[PDB]
């Protein structure tokens, strides 16, 4: 997370550290996650930054995508396995979509129009769907 | 009368304490041109400062030249032109001061009046960079020449190491020459300069059969006259020749002598590895006792390395991911010489034990490297022992555990060592899974 | 595309799919 705030700092300063430097942060991350677990949002901040400073690695990309995803899959399969041992123990439409949003954003730990846009960053990057 | 006064100065002159440029242009001119007239035993007392500085302060070098001009038509001259050239950095160094010494030298060259030592000294460290003036060699090509027919013993090194300084000396006929005339004098041997000859032709591939069997003819004197760095350029010279030139039973004596080394550098141990794998196939079958002895010891200062600091010259904190993989590699390929149904030579399974731990306590930071050895994981599939399976095992979940992105072609390579060696970790299986 | 990085893949392999496509008669010899 305190790389993470060097890369925010360093974005605000619109100054662009080198190539070999954003790499090296990147593979600070990668040996660091296991440690202590970078979380969805601050993976989505420090994935914006590396697109604005113009990081063509796309290595890093990767990686932050990995660890959004990991969340997410986590969470998902935590709240099926909470629903599992449950059932193994055994305006409506304004309300709806506050309830979805709610939903998302507790599985996701992010807004849905930042999510979208990752998938369109992804997206024009050439990932597979 | 001015030997000691000389020396001390050069001995202080190491630490910064002239504050002034001028002051330091004045003692690099004055050292440059009293290089001249001092002995070779004193060479290096002149070198090792200058080097500094001129490892410390490039620029001034131009002014230093400046005011002190090579002149080729004085044999004192020649260390002049023989110690800049270590002098100067390999690769920190301006593009103009490394032409001006390249036309000197050039010049010395065509002068031929300066001493044989001194163009070794002299060439020895133009040979570092070759940047400039691609025909010197070509050049180079004629000064060997001359001196081709008239090298004796104590001369064939000198004009070999220069023949030995560029690659583009690596297609010149005058090593075929100089071949020749070492059939000349094959009987005649001489112990410190035969491994000084074997240490320069080895950078080239080149083999002349004749030439290694008269080595490896008079290998009986070679067992006490030759020392202990003589013996091991020898051996893999030696090796590295065809297989008809390749004496089977001569090539045992240099093996013996090279038995109980004690304190050897690494480099010439990764050179042994090298010799033992550059064998040829058909003369292993007769000479698996002497891999296995060579194997036996290998293994023993092998772990000594690893477990001596780097300080002495070990790797207790060896950084260098692309130096200790090669290091093993090179190791475990000595291991891939046996036959998989021969008994390996005891002792050396301990030196197994050795690497693999050393390489498992370290584990986070050698991933981390920018190009990681995932290339040492075959190395270590290949050997059918359990310990080494369950180090490839350890390797790739660590892979896993930074979720590094893999070339298609290596998560397939991947794959068929797990399913060749029928391996039962999850995490692996998963992160392949999402890899392919 | 970025995301492949100058690594061909199965398309640019050694497979014996891509090896099957060329009528070259394999005199010369890799």
Not at chain 2, 137 to 165: C, D, G, K, N
Not at chain 2, 213 to 226: D, G, H, M, P, T
Not at chain 2, 342 to 367: F, S, W
Request: aromatic content about 6%; glycine content about 6%; proline content about 5%.
């Amino acid at each position: 997370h305190e790389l993470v705030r060097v890369l925010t700092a360093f974005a605000r300063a619109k100054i662009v550290p080198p190539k070999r430097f954003l790499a090296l942060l990147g593979r600070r991350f990668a040996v660091l996650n296991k440690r202590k677990k970078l979380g969805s949002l601050p993976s989505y901040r420090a994935f914006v930054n590396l697109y604005k400073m113009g990081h063509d690695q796309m290595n890093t990309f990767r990686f932050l995508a990995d660890c959004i995803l990991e969340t997410i899959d986590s969470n998902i399969k935590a709240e099926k396995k909470r629903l599992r041992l449950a059932q193994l123990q055994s305006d409506p439409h304004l309300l709806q979509n506050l309830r979805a949003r709610e939903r998302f954003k507790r599985l996701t730990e992010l807004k849905p129009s930042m999510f979208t846009k990752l998938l369109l960053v992804l997206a024009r990057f050439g990932a597979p769907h | 009368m001015l030997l000691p006064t000389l020396e001390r100065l050069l001995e202080r002159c190491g630490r910064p304490i002239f504050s002034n440029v001028e002051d330091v242009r004045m003692v690099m001119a004055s050292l440059l041109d009293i290089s001249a007239y001092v002995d070779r035993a004193s060479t290096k007392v002149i070198a090792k400062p200058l080097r500094r500085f001129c490892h410390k302060d490039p620029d001034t070098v131009a002014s230093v030249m400046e005011a002190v001009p090579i002149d080729a038509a004085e044999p004192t001259h020649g260390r002049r032109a023989a110690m800049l050239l270590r002098c100067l950095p390999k690769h920190s160094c301006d593009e103009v001061i490394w032409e001006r010494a390249v036309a000197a030298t050039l010049a010395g060259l065509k002068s031929r009046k300066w001493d044989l030592h001194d163009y070794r000294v002299a060439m020895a460290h133009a040979g570092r960079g070759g940047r400039h003036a691609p025909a010197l060699a070509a050049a180079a090509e004629e000064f060997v020449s001359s001196s081709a027919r008239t090298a004796s013993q104590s001369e064939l090194p000198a004009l070999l190491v220069i023949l030995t300084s560029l690659p583009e000396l690596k297609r010149s006929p005058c090593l075929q020459v100089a071949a020749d005339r070492i059939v000349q004098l094959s009987e005649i041997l001489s112990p410190a300069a035969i491994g000084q000859i074997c240490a320069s032709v080895n950078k080239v591939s080149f083999r002349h059969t004749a030439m290694a069997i008269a080595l490896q003819e008079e290998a009986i004197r070679f067992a006490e006259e030759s020392d202990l760095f003589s013996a091991v350029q020898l051996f893999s010279f030696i090796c590295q020749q065809e297989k008809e030139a390749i004496s089977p039973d001569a090539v045992k004596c240099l093996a013996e002598r090279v038995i109980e080394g004690k304190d050897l550098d690494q480099e010439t141990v990764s050179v042994l590895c090298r010799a033992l794998r550059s064998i040829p196939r058909p003369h292993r079958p007769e000479l698996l006792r002497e891999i296995g002895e060579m194997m036996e010891f290998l293994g023993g200062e092998v772990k000594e390395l690893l477990e001596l600091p780097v300080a002495k010259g070990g790797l207790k904190g060896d950084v260098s991911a692309g130096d200790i993989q090669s290091f093993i590699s090179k190791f475990l390929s000595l291991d891939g010489l046996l036959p998989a149904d021969h008994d390996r030579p005891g002792t050396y399974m301990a030196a197994i034990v050795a690497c693999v731990d050393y390489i498992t306590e370290r584990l986070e930071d050698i991933v981390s490297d920018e190009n990681p050895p995932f290339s040492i994981i075959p190395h270590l599939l290949n050997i059918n022992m359990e310990e080494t399976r369950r180090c490839g095992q350890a390797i790739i979940r660590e892979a896993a555990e930074q979720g590094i992105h893999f070339p298609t072609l290596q998560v397939f390579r991947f794959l068929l060592a797990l399913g060749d060696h029928n391996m039962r970790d999850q995490r692996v299986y998963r992160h392949l899974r999402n890899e392919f | 595309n970025p995301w492949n990085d100058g690594d061909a893949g199965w398309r640019g392999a050694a497979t014996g799919a891509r090896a099957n496509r060329g009528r070259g008669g394999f005199r010369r010899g890799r």
